[PDB]
Design an enzyme around this catalytic site. Structure first.
Site, PDB file in Angstrom:
ATOM      1  N   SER A  30       1.173  -0.991   0.411  1.00 58.59           N
ATOM      2  CA  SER A  30      -0.242   0.407  -0.160  1.00 58.59           C
ATOM      3  C   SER A  30       0.612   0.828   0.007  1.00 58.59           C
ATOM      4  CB  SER A  30      -1.170  -0.031   1.307  1.00 58.59           C
ATOM      5  OG  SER A  30      -1.847   0.960   0.809  1.00 58.59           O
TER       6      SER A  30
ATOM      7  N   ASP B 286      -9.783  -4.251  -4.703  1.00 56.10           N
ATOM      8  CA  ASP B 286      -9.440  -3.779  -3.561  1.00 56.10           C
ATOM      9  C   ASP B 286     -10.064  -2.067  -4.045  1.00 56.10           C
ATOM     10  OD1 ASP B 286      -7.489  -1.603  -2.538  1.00 56.10           O
ATOM     11  OD2 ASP B 286      -5.836  -2.625  -3.371  1.00 56.10           O
TER      12      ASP B 286
ATOM     13  N   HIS C 167      -8.504  -5.382  -0.304  1.00 54.54           N
ATOM     14  CA  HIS C 167      -6.772  -4.832  -0.350  1.00 54.54           C
ATOM     15  C   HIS C 167      -5.392  -5.486   0.344  1.00 54.54           C
ATOM     16  CE1 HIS C 167      -3.786  -1.201   0.216  1.00 54.54           C
ATOM     17  NE2 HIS C 167      -4.444  -1.066   1.179  1.00 54.54           N
TER      18      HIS C 167
END
Length: 263
Positions: free
Chosen positions: A133, A179, A210
């Site tokens: 991320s 996601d 995610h």
């Protein structure tokens, strides 16, 4: 010609999909983290030569737990891996990148410190970056800023900017189909399409949220195989892994596969 960096027996799909590679793994907690919050070092005891090092960074609000599984998985195939917590859980991508590089730096320091478990175990010329991320965005920033890095394999990356056109480091992007934090259409895919100078790969996990490449994920066989193969091919120049690194894995767990300049 003989590759001085080749480690371990010849790979198979089964050996790469297994929960662990050939080498015995130990770990320790870094006593005085230098330039980042906390760290755990994973290393092979019996790799048969010095190995490359990989630094892995979590996402915003997240901790080592989210990315921990990479530590034993990669170390058991012949890498020294440092997983970090950031100085603040609310650090942004640039800061995560600096911290990631600081962690690699400390691995080099420890390689030269006789008291350390990893004394003399690391080839400090051969390094890689991974992360989730905003830690994946940080990994891309690290690669952009330090093109001597040998490989990058971020997962579900996110940055305010998707232009990584300068990156010349071999980069595997793990993406997660569904996601909604860093949507593939606004983050991972435009990042992948921006990079025209490198070996690169895009591996999107079918139905993935995610967290699809995090610890405890349901695709550790495939994701682990691909991560290890990418790092072997590019960190170790190990052409035994070229097929595994570059191939479409022809898996129903993959909703999108792309690669360029991979051989």
């Amino acid at each position: 010609a003989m590759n001085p960096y080749a480690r371990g027996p010849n790979p198979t799909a089964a050996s790469l999909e297994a929960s662990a590679g050939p080498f015995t793994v130990r770990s320790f907690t870094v006593s005085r983290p230098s330039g980042y919050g906390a760290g755990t070092v994973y290393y092979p005891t019996n790799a048969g030569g010095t190995v490359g090092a990989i630094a892995i960074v979590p996402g915003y609000t997240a901790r080592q737990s989210s990315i921990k599984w990479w530590g034993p998985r990669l170390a058991s195939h012949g890498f020294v891996v440092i997983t970090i917590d950031t100085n603040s859980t609310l650090d942004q991508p640039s800061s995560r990148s600096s911290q990631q590089m600081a962690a690699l730096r400390q691995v080099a320091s420890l390689n030269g410190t006789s008291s350390s478990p990893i004394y003399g175990k690391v080839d400090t010329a051969r390094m890689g970056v991974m992360g989730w991320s905003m830690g994946g965005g940080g990994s891309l920033i690290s690669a952009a800023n330090n093109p001597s890095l040998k490989a990058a394999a971020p997962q579900a990356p996110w940055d305010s900017s998707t232009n990584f056109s300068s990156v010349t480091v071999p980069t595997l992007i793990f993406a997660c189909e569904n996601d909604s934090i860093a949507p593939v259409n606004s983050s991972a895919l435009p990042i992948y399409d921006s990079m025209s100078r490198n070996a690169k790969q895009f591996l999107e996990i079918n139905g993935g949220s995610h967290s699809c490449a995090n610890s405890g994920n349901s695709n550790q066989a495939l994701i682990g195989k691909k991560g290890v193969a990418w790092m072997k091919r590019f960190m170790d120049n190990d052409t035994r892994y070229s097929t595994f690194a570059c191939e479409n894995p022809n898996s129903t767990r993959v909703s999108d596969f792309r690669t360029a300049n991979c051989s």
